[PDB]
Motif scaffolding. Structure first.
Motif, PDB file in Angstrom:
ATOM      1  N   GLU A   1       1.562  -9.920  -9.288  1.00  0.00           N
ATOM      2  CA  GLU A   1       1.972 -10.357  -7.964  1.00  0.00           C
ATOM      3  C   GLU A   1       0.991  -9.854  -6.911  1.00  0.00           C
ATOM      4  O   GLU A   1       0.290  -8.857  -7.097  1.00  0.00           O
ATOM      5  N   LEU A   2       0.951 -10.561  -5.788  1.00  0.00           N
ATOM      6  CA  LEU A   2       0.044 -10.230  -4.702  1.00  0.00           C
ATOM      7  C   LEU A   2       0.676  -9.198  -3.779  1.00  0.00           C
ATOM      8  O   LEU A   2       1.886  -9.223  -3.533  1.00  0.00           O
ATOM      9  N   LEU A   3      -0.150  -8.290  -3.271  1.00  0.00           N
ATOM     10  CA  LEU A   3       0.327  -7.209  -2.425  1.00  0.00           C
ATOM     11  C   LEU A   3       0.537  -7.686  -0.990  1.00  0.00           C
ATOM     12  O   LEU A   3       0.090  -8.763  -0.584  1.00  0.00           O
ATOM     13  N   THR A   4       1.230  -6.858  -0.219  1.00  0.00           N
ATOM     14  CA  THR A   4       1.410  -7.022   1.217  1.00  0.00           C
ATOM     15  C   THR A   4       0.752  -5.843   1.926  1.00  0.00           C
ATOM     16  O   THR A   4       0.127  -4.987   1.294  1.00  0.00           O
ATOM     17  N   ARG A   5       0.888  -5.798   3.252  1.00  0.00           N
ATOM     18  CA  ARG A   5       0.330  -4.674   4.000  1.00  0.00           C
ATOM     19  C   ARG A   5       0.982  -3.363   3.585  1.00  0.00           C
ATOM     20  O   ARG A   5       0.291  -2.375   3.307  1.00  0.00           O
ATOM     21  N   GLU A   6       2.312  -3.348   3.507  1.00  0.00           N
ATOM     22  CA  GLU A   6       3.021  -2.135   3.118  1.00  0.00           C
ATOM     23  C   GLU A   6       2.633  -1.706   1.711  1.00  0.00           C
ATOM     24  O   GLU A   6       2.466  -0.511   1.444  1.00  0.00           O
ATOM     25  N   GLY A   7       2.480  -2.668   0.800  1.00  0.00           N
ATOM     26  CA  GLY A   7       2.053  -2.334  -0.547  1.00  0.00           C
ATOM     27  C   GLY A   7       0.663  -1.729  -0.587  1.00  0.00           C
ATOM     28  O   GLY A   7       0.415  -0.770  -1.323  1.00  0.00           O
ATOM     29  N   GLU A   8      -0.265  -2.287   0.193  1.00  0.00           N
ATOM     30  CA  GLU A   8      -1.614  -1.735   0.233  1.00  0.00           C
ATOM     31  C   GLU A   8      -1.616  -0.313   0.775  1.00  0.00           C
ATOM     32  O   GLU A   8      -2.288   0.567   0.220  1.00  0.00           O
ATOM     33  N   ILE A   9      -0.863  -0.060   1.850  1.00  0.00           N
ATOM     34  CA  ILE A   9      -0.791   1.301   2.380  1.00  0.00           C
ATOM     35  C   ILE A   9      -0.136   2.243   1.374  1.00  0.00           C
ATOM     36  O   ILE A   9      -0.571   3.389   1.210  1.00  0.00           O
ATOM     37  N   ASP A  10       0.899   1.781   0.671  1.00  0.00           N
ATOM     38  CA  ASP A  10       1.553   2.636  -0.316  1.00  0.00           C
ATOM     39  C   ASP A  10       0.609   2.999  -1.458  1.00  0.00           C
ATOM     40  O   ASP A  10       0.535   4.165  -1.870  1.00  0.00           O
ATOM     41  N   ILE A  11      -0.130   2.017  -1.976  1.00  0.00           N
ATOM     42  CA  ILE A  11      -1.062   2.291  -3.066  1.00  0.00           C
ATOM     43  C   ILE A  11      -2.186   3.208  -2.598  1.00  0.00           C
ATOM     44  O   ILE A  11      -2.596   4.128  -3.319  1.00  0.00           O
ATOM     45  N   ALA A  12      -2.702   2.980  -1.387  1.00  0.00           N
ATOM     46  CA  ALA A  12      -3.739   3.861  -0.860  1.00  0.00           C
ATOM     47  C   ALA A  12      -3.216   5.282  -0.697  1.00  0.00           C
ATOM     48  O   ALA A  12      -3.932   6.254  -0.975  1.00  0.00           O
ATOM     49  N   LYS A  13      -1.969   5.421  -0.249  1.00  0.00           N
ATOM     50  CA  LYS A  13      -1.367   6.740  -0.121  1.00  0.00           C
ATOM     51  C   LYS A  13      -1.252   7.421  -1.474  1.00  0.00           C
ATOM     52  O   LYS A  13      -1.478   8.628  -1.587  1.00  0.00           O
ATOM     53  N   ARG A  14      -0.892   6.666  -2.513  1.00  0.00           N
ATOM     54  CA  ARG A  14      -0.819   7.254  -3.849  1.00  0.00           C
ATOM     55  C   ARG A  14      -2.192   7.705  -4.336  1.00  0.00           C
ATOM     56  O   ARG A  14      -2.322   8.775  -4.948  1.00  0.00           O
ATOM     57  N   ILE A  15      -3.229   6.908  -4.073  1.00  0.00           N
ATOM     58  CA  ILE A  15      -4.584   7.310  -4.451  1.00  0.00           C
ATOM     59  C   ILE A  15      -4.966   8.606  -3.746  1.00  0.00           C
ATOM     60  O   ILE A  15      -5.500   9.540  -4.360  1.00  0.00           O
ATOM     61  N   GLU A  16      -4.699   8.674  -2.440  1.00  0.00           N
ATOM     62  CA  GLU A  16      -5.032   9.873  -1.680  1.00  0.00           C
ATOM     63  C   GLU A  16      -4.235  11.073  -2.169  1.00  0.00           C
ATOM     64  O   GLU A  16      -4.753  12.193  -2.214  1.00  0.00           O
ATOM     65  N   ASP A  17      -2.970  10.861  -2.534  1.00  0.00           N
ATOM     66  CA  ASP A  17      -2.140  11.950  -3.031  1.00  0.00           C
ATOM     67  C   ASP A  17      -2.712  12.493  -4.333  1.00  0.00           C
ATOM     68  O   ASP A  17      -2.819  13.711  -4.517  1.00  0.00           O
ATOM     69  N   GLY A  18      -3.105  11.603  -5.244  1.00  0.00           N
ATOM     70  CA  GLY A  18      -3.707  12.057  -6.487  1.00  0.00           C
ATOM     71  C   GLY A  18      -5.007  12.808  -6.265  1.00  0.00           C
ATOM     72  O   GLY A  18      -5.254  13.845  -6.891  1.00  0.00           O
ATOM     73  N   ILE A  19      -5.854  12.297  -5.371  1.00  0.00           N
ATOM     74  CA  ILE A  19      -7.111  12.979  -5.075  1.00  0.00           C
ATOM     75  C   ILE A  19      -6.842  14.346  -4.460  1.00  0.00           C
ATOM     76  O   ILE A  19      -7.548  15.321  -4.745  1.00  0.00           O
TER      77      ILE A  19
END
Length: 52
Positions: free
Chosen positions: A7-25
């Motif tokens: 499925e295609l992402l939305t704005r909220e989904g993109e921010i959530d995934i970016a937040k998860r990447i930053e959290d892992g880093i």
DNA sequence: ATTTTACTAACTGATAGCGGAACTTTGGGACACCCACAGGTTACGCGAAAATGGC
């Protein structure tokens, strides 16, 4: 066929995934920080850098 | 006495090396937003053998 099943992402989904990447880093960075060899390396790198 | 030749030294060219600056070459980056493709085709025909379907 294999690509369409995602499925295609939305704005909220993109921010959530970016937040998860930053959290892992950030977790990885914290893990590296808890190391006696890590901080002196950064300190000596800054010591050479500030000397221009 | 004269002429031919062997020996030697100097010139010159090729060539390997180097300097260095210009020239070619490689790798990285770019923050409005953009979110599923072609893509011509075919009036063959025949025989075998191989793969499917029927009950």
């Amino acid at each position: 066929r294999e690509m369409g099943t995602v499925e295609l992402l939305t704005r909220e989904g993109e921010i959530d995934i970016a937040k998860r990447i930053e959290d892992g880093i950030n977790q990885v960075q914290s893990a590296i920080a808890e190391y006696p060899g890590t901080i002196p390396y950064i300190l000596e790198q800054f010591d050479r850098v500030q000397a221009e």
